[PDB]
Amino acid sequence: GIDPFTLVQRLEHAAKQAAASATQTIAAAQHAASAPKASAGPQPLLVQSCKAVAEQIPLLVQGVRGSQAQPDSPSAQLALIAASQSFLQPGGKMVAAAKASVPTIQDQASAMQLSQCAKNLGTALAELRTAAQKAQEA
Fold it and tell me: Where are the alpha helices (DSSP H) in the chain?
């Protein structure tokens, strides 16, 4: 009957919205940066993770597109699964940093924007983290 993609199904969907939400979170985080001007090195965890996440975003989508083309390919599967878990590492950091940086952002627009972005990214990771989990160990 109807046998769908399964496991990679949730990977595709979660990684797409993760990549989307990540980009939005990055654009908000480094828009203001909750870094004080008086110090010897106030490098915001946001921006540090933003650059990390920014390079992981294409990997997600690359994995996604690979899974779309070859859902029955362990090469594409493990690629997406690995990329997902690789994205979670810096991605989760930016989420944690974002929520704590919101109240310390002087620009109200950026603060409220970051709040929504991190809320999306956090939930995106919630999907992706569980998605790759099911696809990996089953």
Answer: 8-32, 45-69, 74-101, 108-136
